[PDB]
Structure formats: structure tokens, C-alpha cells
Design a protein around this ligand. Structure first.
Ligand SMILES: Cc1ccc2c(c1)cc([C@H]1C[C@H](n3ccnc3CN)CN1C(=O)c1cnc3[nH]ccc3c1)n2Cc1ccc(Cl)cc1
Length: 228
């Protein structure tokens, strides 16, 4: 049930999935829980800095909506071109882009209705600085792009999309660490697909210290810091 780089394919039609799962019953419920958790990480728990890199963004922006409260600069990334195109239609405010309005409104509600949808959308659009290819199996997952050491790497539902075996996952997390300052944050929100202990081993062996781990089969979230 594992995927390797030689077997990986992402959904060819990312738009149909946005329409199905990101329009918000079971899926709406799960998305709400994710969004509440991301609110806590990025607006309460001290995960903040200048530069966040979202690894394996997929075609979605919901995982960045609270994060742009806490990071001036966000880089979104994906191995597959069709996911990057779906992101760019939205960032560039094209008429053909997915309508993230309902989710955006819901996040504005979680944040106390300090702003309305358009203002929140604009804050995210201003924060997203680059849209790039990544390959987590590479020592330099973003290739030659000369980003400075970042404050946070976020990975959401990546195991959920395709699960590598444990040493491959540990190596990916260690490759992602090359993107982080010492002490930089690693935030993972994903599917348990050896369970919690396997995730914890991969995180620790990839050179991070877990601050906390929460169950939110099943979904978890965790925040770790790269060894300092
Ligand atoms: C630390 C981490 C671990 C696993 C990850 C990710 C991060 C990110 C993803 C994948 C899945 C993710 N996705 C696609 C649709 N929705 C989501 C989640 N938002 C996008 N996306 C990638 O952009 C990606 C990155 N680099 C790669 N190199 C070879 C394939 C490949 C895919 N994997 C799935 C995956 C499975 C097996 C293998 Cl060997 C490698 C990756």
C-alpha cells in the first residue's frame, strides 16, 4: 500500500476534487476540524516567522489561511504541474479559479470576524511569494531556488494523498530540514497510514524534536522544531 517515486501520480483533475471535498458532509466535518487545528497552530501556539514553505501543497489554499496571519512570506510547492496551475489560477484571481469563498468565510469566523473574506483573501495573495516544483526525495527539494533558511515547513495531507514507506518518509523529512533554520518549525497535519510511533520515529530520526502531537486510522497534527 506504499507509493514510491516510480509509482507516484497525483489526481489528473484536481478541480473535480476541489468541487467535491472543498466546497463545504463527512468531508465538510473533516475540513472544519483541520481548519480549527490550523487556527490553533498558527494563531495561538507561537508558530510564526518571516518565511513559511508549504511542501506538497496540492491544489488547495485552505491550509494557508490562518498561516498568513503569522508569516509575511509563504512559498507554495508541488511535484505536479496540474496542482500548481490550480493554485496559480486562484492566486492570480482568474475567473476560472476554484471558489474558496465559503472556506475563507469560515476561517474569518474562526478568527473572530476581525476581517471579511476579500480582505483575508488579499492578505493570502500578498503573502504567497513563489509557486514552485518540489521533490521531497531530493537533497535539495526545491532544486536551485536560493531561498534563505525558512522559519516553518508545513506538510498537510501528504501521506493521505500517497504514503511512502517509513525510511522514505524519514528521508523526505530530513531533506525538508535543509530548508529550515536551526530551531525552525515543522508542522504536519496528516493521516495515520505502525501509526503514531512510526511518525514519531521518522520525525525524531530526521533531526527534529516534537513539541506536541495530537489526534484530531485517523488524522493527527504535530509541531516539531529542527535541532538547534
Ligand atoms: C514530507 C512529505 C512526505 C510525503 C509526501 C509529501 C511530503 C508531498 C507528497 C505529495 C502528495 C501531495 N498532495 C497531492 C495532493 N494533495 C497533496 C497533499 N496536500 C503533493 N505531493 C508532492 O508534491 C510530492 C513531493 N515530492 C515528490 N517526490 C516524488 C513524488 C512527490 C510528490 N507526498 C507523497 C509522496 C509519496 C511518495 C513519495 Cl516517494 C514522495 C512523496
Amino acid at each position: 500500500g506504499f507509493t514510491s517515486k516510480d509509482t507516484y501520480l497525483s489526481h489528473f483533475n484536481p478541480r473535480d476534487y476541489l468541487e467535491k471535498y472543498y466546497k463545504f458532509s463527512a468531508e465538510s466535518q473533516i475540513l472544519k476540524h483541520l481548519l480549527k487545528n490550523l487556527f490553533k497552530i498558527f494563531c495561538l501556539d507561537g508558530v510564526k516567522g518571516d518565511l513559511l514553505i508549504d511542501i506538497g501543497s496540492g491544489p488547495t489554499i485552505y491550509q494557508l489561511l490562518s498561516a498568513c496571519e503569522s508569516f509575511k512570506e509563504i512559498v507554495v510547492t508541488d511535484y505536479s504541474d496540474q496542482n500548481l496551475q490550480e493554485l496559480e489560477k486562484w492566486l492570480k484571481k482568474e475567473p476560472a479559479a476554484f471558489d474558496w469563498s465559503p472556506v475563507v468565510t469560515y476561517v474569518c469566523d474562526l478568527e473572530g470576524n476581525r476581517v471579511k473574506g476579500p480582505e483575508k483573501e488579499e492578505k493570502l495573495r500578498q503573502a504567497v511569494k513563489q509557486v514552485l516544483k518540489c521533490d521531497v526525495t531530493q537533497s535539495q527539494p526545491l532544486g536551485a531556488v536560493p531561498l534563505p533558511p525558512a522559519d516553518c515547513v508545513l506538510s498537510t495531507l501528504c501521506l493521505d494523498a500517497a504514503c511512502p514507506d517509513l525510511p522514505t518518509y524519514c528521508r523526505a523529512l530530513r531533506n525538508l530540514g535543509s530548508l529550515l533554520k536551526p530551531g525552525g518549525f515543522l508542522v504536519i497535519m496528516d493521516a495515520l497510514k505502525g501509526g503514531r510511533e512510526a511518525v514519531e520515529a521518522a520525525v525524531k530520526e530526521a533531526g527534529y524534536t516534537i513539541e506536541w502531537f495530537e489526534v484530531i486510522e485517523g488524522l493527527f497534527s504535530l509541531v516539531a522544531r529542527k535541532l538547534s
